[PDB]
C-alpha cells in the first residue's frame, strides 16, 4: 500500500476518529502515524482512527 | 506386564504367549479409569471478534 501498487477498503460501521492539524508549508510522510495506529489493533479492540 | 511376566521374562521383553490376557487387563484398567461424571462448568460468551 505504501508503494503505489495497492488500494485497501476497510469496512467499518462506525468508529471513534481523531485528527491532527499540520502546517501546509512542511513536507512530511504520514506513514508513521498509520503504523502506530496499526501497532495497537488486536482482536479485542482498536484505537481511534487518525 | 500385568501377569505372567513378573519373574519370567526380561525387563526389556514382553511375553508373546500371554498377550491376550495382558491386553485384556490393560483395557480393563483403561475402562475403570474413565468411570466419572462429566460435570458442567461456567459457560460464557466472548466479546472477541473471533
Amino acid at each position: 500500500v505504501k508503494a503505489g501498487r495497492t488500494r485497501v477498503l476497510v469496512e467499518l460501521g462506525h468508529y471513534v476518529y481523531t485528527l491532527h492539524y499540520y502546517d501546509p508549508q512542511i513536507s512530511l510522510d504520514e506513514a508513521p502515524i498509520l503504523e502506530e495506529w496499526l501497532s495497537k489493533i488486536n482482536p479485542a479492540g482498536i484505537p481511534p482512527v487518525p | 506386564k500385568t501377569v505372567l511376566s513378573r519373574g519370567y521374562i526380561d525387563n526389556a521383553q514382553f511375553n508373546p504367549l500371554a498377550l491376550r490376557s495382558n491386553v485384556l487387563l490393560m483395557l480393563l484398567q483403561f475402562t475403570l479409569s474413565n468411570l466419572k461424571i462429566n460435570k458442567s462448568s461456567t459457560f460464557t460468551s466472548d466479546v472477541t471478534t473471533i
Binding site: 501497532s39 495497537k40 489493533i41 482482536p43 479485542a44 | 460464557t44 460468551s45 466472548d46 466479546v47
Partner: peptide
C-alpha cells in the same frame, strides 16, 4: 469522573487469552 465497572471475570479471562502480538519480527518484507 465517569461511570465504569469491571467486566465479569470469565469474560476478561477468555478475552485476554486470544491477543496475538501486533508487531512481530519477520525477516521478509519484499
Amino acid at each position: 469522573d465517569i461511570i465504569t465497572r469491571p467486566t465479569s471475570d470469565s469474560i476478561a479471562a477468555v478475552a485476554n487469552a486470544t491477543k496475538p502480538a501486533a508487531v512481530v519480527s519477520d525477516p521478509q518484507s519484499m
